Design a protein around this ligand. Sequence first.
Ligand SMILES: CN(C)C(=O)c1ccc(F)cc1Br
Length: 284
Amino acid sequence: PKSMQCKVILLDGSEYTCDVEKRSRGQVLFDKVCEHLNLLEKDYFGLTYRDAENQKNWLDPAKEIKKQVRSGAWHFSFNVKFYPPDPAQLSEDITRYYLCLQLRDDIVSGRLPCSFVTLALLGSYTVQSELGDYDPDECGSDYISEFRFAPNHTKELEDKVIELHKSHRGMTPAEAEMHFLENAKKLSMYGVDLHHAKDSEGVEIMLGVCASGLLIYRDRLRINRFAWPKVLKISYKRNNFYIKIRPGEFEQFESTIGFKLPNHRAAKRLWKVCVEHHTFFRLL
Ligand SMILES: CN(C)C(=O)c1ccc(F)cc1Br
């Protein structure tokens, strides 16, 4: 039995190394990573890899690892795949903990835009979780946390984190993580997977995929939203991605919205992530 070395970037930024038989399906590696993390609520998570176009792809647990990474290195990241609309309903604190780490990366990276005050508040819960109660000793007027809180740090933001941290005295890690999630889950881009596309007129848009449905970001003014109930069918052909929309009551015929993706692979990727979110957030 020939085994391949796999390297997985964990959500705390550490590296986990293991071996799988070279013909292993993605589920085999995923089960090994989840055991290492003591994670039971595995359905929300998945492994990503970077393709030869350098694009993030979900490792399909049902398919051979080798048929997906193809020519690439057996290097992966551990990520949230389905962001729970209501993290309070997850059964385990460790589940909420990994969701927090993913979200901290979403914020720092700028995938999850956040106001000043919400950056500082989220920051303040992370600090309470990780260091416990505010202590002036390791905090002077010039203090700067090791914690990355935002795409761009300012002294004002560091001060606001400390001010809000003072207010959380006695808060346990599980409690701070729950408060973090009750705030994060309300952000307009929470759990939104964005894909670059052009509309049928050739205008640059973003397609968002999330729990509740599809979002078409034309710009800040005029954002189309298709709840899953409204979506009849979605398809891809070549570089094209088409959304079939239900008729309104006493309308005879569905509407079709077509989009142009950068290439055939980007169309197929968007299609797969829509089907997966549609299945998940038709069962939840
Ligand atoms: C193949 N497939 C699952 C579809 O075309 C689809 C249909 C309805 C919907 F709400 C979302 C999707 Br995705």
